[PDB]
Design an enzyme around this catalytic site. Structure first.
Site, PDB file in Angstrom:
ATOM      1  N   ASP A 196       0.879  -1.176   0.000  1.00 44.06           N
ATOM      2  CA  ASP A 196       0.000   0.000   0.000  1.00 44.06           C
ATOM      3  C   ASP A 196       0.912   1.219   0.000  1.00 44.06           C
ATOM      4  O   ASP A 196       1.605   1.492   0.993  1.00 44.06           O
ATOM      5  CB  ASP A 196      -0.859  -0.024   1.287  1.00 44.06           C
ATOM      6  CG  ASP A 196      -1.925   1.068   1.257  1.00 44.06           C
ATOM      7  OD1 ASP A 196      -1.736   2.045   0.508  1.00 44.06           O
ATOM      8  OD2 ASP A 196      -2.910   0.928   1.984  1.00 44.06           O
ATOM      9  N   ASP A 213      -3.908   6.823  -3.333  1.00 39.52           N
ATOM     10  CA  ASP A 213      -3.726   5.742  -2.341  1.00 39.52           C
ATOM     11  C   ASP A 213      -4.226   4.497  -3.072  1.00 39.52           C
ATOM     12  O   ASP A 213      -5.392   4.442  -3.433  1.00 39.52           O
ATOM     13  CB  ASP A 213      -4.534   6.032  -1.078  1.00 39.52           C
ATOM     14  CG  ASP A 213      -4.222   5.037   0.038  1.00 39.52           C
ATOM     15  OD1 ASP A 213      -3.580   3.994  -0.241  1.00 39.52           O
ATOM     16  OD2 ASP A 213      -4.608   5.311   1.183  1.00 39.52           O
ATOM     17  N   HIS A 250     -11.894   5.939   2.522  1.00 42.14           N
ATOM     18  CA  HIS A 250     -11.883   7.305   3.102  1.00 42.14           C
ATOM     19  C   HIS A 250     -11.826   8.386   2.036  1.00 42.14           C
ATOM     20  O   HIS A 250     -11.235   8.165   0.987  1.00 42.14           O
ATOM     21  CB  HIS A 250     -10.688   7.490   4.045  1.00 42.14           C
ATOM     22  CG  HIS A 250      -9.367   7.080   3.483  1.00 42.14           C
ATOM     23  ND1 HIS A 250      -8.434   7.943   2.942  1.00 42.14           N
ATOM     24  CD2 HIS A 250      -8.843   5.826   3.388  1.00 42.14           C
ATOM     25  CE1 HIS A 250      -7.392   7.224   2.530  1.00 42.14           C
ATOM     26  NE2 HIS A 250      -7.621   5.954   2.799  1.00 42.14           N
ATOM     27  N   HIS A 304      -6.779  11.496   4.863  1.00 35.09           N
ATOM     28  CA  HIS A 304      -8.062  11.110   5.417  1.00 35.09           C
ATOM     29  C   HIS A 304      -8.845  12.413   5.637  1.00 35.09           C
ATOM     30  O   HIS A 304      -8.640  13.005   6.696  1.00 35.09           O
ATOM     31  CB  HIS A 304      -7.932  10.349   6.749  1.00 35.09           C
ATOM     32  CG  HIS A 304      -9.264   9.774   7.149  1.00 35.09           C
ATOM     33  ND1 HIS A 304     -10.470  10.338   6.747  1.00 35.09           N
ATOM     34  CD2 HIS A 304      -9.576   8.715   7.943  1.00 35.09           C
ATOM     35  CE1 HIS A 304     -11.459   9.640   7.258  1.00 35.09           C
ATOM     36  NE2 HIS A 304     -10.952   8.663   7.996  1.00 35.09           N
ATOM     37  N   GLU A 336     -11.107   1.109  -0.606  1.00 33.35           N
ATOM     38  CA  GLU A 336     -10.261  -0.055  -0.261  1.00 33.35           C
ATOM     39  C   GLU A 336     -11.128  -1.012   0.544  1.00 33.35           C
ATOM     40  O   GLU A 336     -12.035  -0.581   1.276  1.00 33.35           O
ATOM     41  CB  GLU A 336      -9.057   0.343   0.571  1.00 33.35           C
ATOM     42  CG  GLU A 336      -9.337   1.025   1.903  1.00 33.35           C
ATOM     43  CD  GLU A 336      -8.099   1.699   2.449  1.00 33.35           C
ATOM     44  OE1 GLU A 336      -7.017   1.061   2.513  1.00 33.35           O
ATOM     45  OE2 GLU A 336      -8.132   2.891   2.813  1.00 33.35           O
ATOM     46  N   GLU A 350      -7.140  -1.792  -3.416  1.00 32.77           N
ATOM     47  CA  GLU A 350      -7.605  -0.420  -3.229  1.00 32.77           C
ATOM     48  C   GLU A 350      -7.373   0.381  -4.515  1.00 32.77           C
ATOM     49  O   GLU A 350      -6.310   0.248  -5.121  1.00 32.77           O
ATOM     50  CB  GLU A 350      -6.755   0.275  -2.143  1.00 32.77           C
ATOM     51  CG  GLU A 350      -7.142   1.763  -1.970  1.00 32.77           C
ATOM     52  CD  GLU A 350      -6.212   2.340  -0.912  1.00 32.77           C
ATOM     53  OE1 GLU A 350      -5.005   1.942  -0.943  1.00 32.77           O
ATOM     54  OE2 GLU A 350      -6.711   3.134  -0.107  1.00 32.77           O
TER      55      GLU A 350
HETATM   56  C1  LIG Z   1      -3.852   3.691   6.893  1.00 37.63           C
HETATM   57  C2  LIG Z   1      -5.367   3.516   6.620  1.00 37.63           C
HETATM   58  O1  LIG Z   1      -5.550   3.830   5.303  1.00 37.63           O
HETATM   59  C3  LIG Z   1      -5.738   2.049   6.771  1.00 37.63           C
HETATM   60  C4  LIG Z   1      -7.211   1.743   6.410  1.00 37.63           C
HETATM   61  C5  LIG Z   1      -8.142   2.674   7.171  1.00 37.63           C
HETATM   62  O2  LIG Z   1      -9.047   2.297   7.868  1.00 37.63           O
HETATM   63  C6  LIG Z   1      -7.789   4.164   6.993  1.00 37.63           C
HETATM   64  O3  LIG Z   1      -8.633   5.006   7.782  1.00 37.63           O
HETATM   65  C7  LIG Z   1      -9.903   5.197   7.169  1.00 37.63           C
HETATM   66  C8  LIG Z   1      -6.320   4.373   7.454  1.00 37.63           C
HETATM   67  O4  LIG Z   1      -6.307   4.036   8.755  1.00 37.63           O
HETATM   68  C9  LIG Z   1      -6.001   5.872   7.325  1.00 37.63           C
HETATM   69  C10 LIG Z   1      -6.260   6.691   6.069  1.00 37.63           C
HETATM   70  O5  LIG Z   1      -6.398   6.674   8.461  1.00 37.63           O
HETATM   71  C11 LIG Z   1      -5.039   6.456   8.379  1.00 37.63           C
HETATM   72  C12 LIG Z   1      -4.207   7.687   8.018  1.00 37.63           C
HETATM   73  C13 LIG Z   1      -3.075   7.301   7.057  1.00 37.63           C
HETATM   74  C14 LIG Z   1      -1.803   7.000   7.306  1.00 37.63           C
HETATM   75  C15 LIG Z   1      -0.940   6.456   6.187  1.00 37.63           C
HETATM   76  C16 LIG Z   1      -1.207   6.899   8.699  1.00 37.63           C
HETATM   77 CO   LIG Z   2      -6.308   4.091   2.073  1.00 38.02          CO
HETATM   78 CO   LIG Z   3      -3.721   2.814   1.031  1.00 36.99          CO
END
Ligand SMILES: *C[C@@]1(O)CCC(=O)[C@@H](OC)[C@]1(O)[C@@]1(C)O[C@@H]1CC=C(C)C
Ligand SMILES: [Co+2]
Ligand SMILES: [Co+2]
Length: 355
Positions: free
Chosen positions: A128, A139, A208, A216, A241, A336
């Site tokens: 990712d 993303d 997100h 986010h 995703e 994703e």
């Molecule tokens: C890292 C993440 O994308 C994993 C999948 C999620 O649930 C998502 O949140 C909606 C994330 O937790 C994300 C976007 O909040 C984190 C912020 C991103 C980073 C890379 C720390």
């Molecule tokens: Co993401």
């Molecule tokens: Co991602």
């Protein structure tokens, strides 16, 4: 020119007119064409980032093999990403650290310095990684495996992600996207080492919305039923995703933290503690509100920073994002894409010939 064998030509040098390839354009499930065209510089920046992501990931799929360390994998990927995005401070660069979460860990693992982890034949690794131009972030993520025993688990999650992508649209309720993803994901049953499972979406992980320099942007896309009936809106951009698991379908924080990101709403904070002030300055200059990892501090020549980093976390200026893992012995997979909700159509901007 043309791209090289191992990619080395910046995307911007492959398209001299500065017009980058569109991703897949879809009808949703006059004035609006003028509206679409008025934001063309933004769509174009996302497309430049997406083409970097397509070329980087194709390259990665050619060499990623068991026996490499997770550090070797991430540094070789990030090297290529920096070259093709034509890294330039906060104007172009890596949007967030290279996730390479393994097995029951689904998200937010990348190795810190000293990690001796080696990728194994039976591992299921979620790659990712993100690119951006002017803060317009891609993303996009896929799962790497070497044993064909995971093939149906990967197919379930890919199909669930493509279902969420097809359901998305202007005025669509986010809860309806989650219900649809879950219904497709749970239609798959898999058999791994003689045990059978119904694939379950990981209910406390989400897609997100994405904002400028903001991975986010505040709206979450559920991957199970039961979520909010908040609607998606014209002009929004989403990371769609999904994550499927053979475990509980729930992740918890686990292992050492590697991923950190400044709180977007926190403004200037005067700090006199010297090491903590310096590290905040380093973060502000190099990452702004983009996520970063400890390896990326090491490469800037920072050292003795872990207490400063904790201080910034305890102050609420920076937030830690530790690895997110289901139960021991379970298997998780992720696919994703980033989608643009343009006025005239839905563009799966990071779509490739691979997934
Ligand atoms: C890292 C993440 O994308 C994993 C999948 C999620 O649930 C998502 O949140 C909606 C994330 O937790 C994300 C976007 O909040 C984190 C912020 C991103 C980073 C890379 C720390
Ligand atoms: Co993401
Ligand atoms: Co991602």
């Amino acid at each position: 020119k043309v791209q090289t064998d191992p990619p080395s030509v910046p995307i911007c040098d492959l398209y001299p007119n500065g017009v980058f390839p569109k991703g897949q354009e879809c009808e949703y499930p006059e004035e609006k064409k003028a509206l679409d065209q008025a934001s063309e510089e933004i769509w174009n920046d996302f497309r430049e980032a997406a083409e970097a992501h397509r070329q980087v990931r194709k390259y990665v799929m050619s060499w990623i093999k068991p026996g490499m360390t997770m550090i070797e994998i991430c540094e070789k990927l990030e090297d290529c990403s920096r070259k093709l995005i034509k890294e330039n401070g906060l104007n172009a660069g890596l949007a967030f650290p290279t996730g390479c979460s393994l097995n029951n860990c689904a998200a937010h693992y990348t190795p810190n310095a000293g990690d001796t982890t080696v990728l194994q034949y039976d591992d299921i690794c979620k790659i990712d990684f993100g690119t951006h131009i002017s803060g317009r972030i891609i993303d996009c993520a896929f799962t790497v495996t070497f044993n064909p025993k995971y093939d149906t688990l990967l197919k379930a999650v890919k199909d669930a992600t493509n279902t969420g992508i097809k359901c998305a649209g202007i005025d669509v309720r986010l809860c309806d996207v989650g219900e649809a993803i879950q219904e497709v994901m749970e239609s798959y049953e898999v058999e791994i080492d003689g045990k059978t499972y119904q694939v379950k979406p990981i209910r406390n992980l989400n897609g997100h919305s994405i904002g400028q320099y903001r991975i986010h942007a505040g709206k979450t896309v559920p991957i199970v039923k039961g979520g909010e009936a908040t609607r998606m809106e014209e002009g929004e951009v989403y990371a769609i995703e999904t994550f499927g698991s053979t475990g509980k379908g729930v992740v918890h924080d686990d292992m050492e933290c590697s991923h950190y990101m400044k709180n977007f709403d926190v403004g200037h904070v005067p700090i006199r503690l010297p090491r903590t002030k310096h590290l905040l300055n380093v973060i502000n200059e190099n990452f702004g509100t983009l996520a970063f990892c400890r390896r990326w501090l090491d490469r800037l020549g920072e050292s003795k920073y872990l207490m400063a980093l904790k201080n910034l976390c305890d102050l609420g200026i920076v937030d830690p994002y530790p690895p997110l893992c289901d139960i021991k012995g379970s298997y998780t997979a992720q696919f994703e894409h980033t989608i643009l909700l343009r006025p005239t159509c839905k563009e799966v901007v990071s779509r490739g010939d691979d997934y």
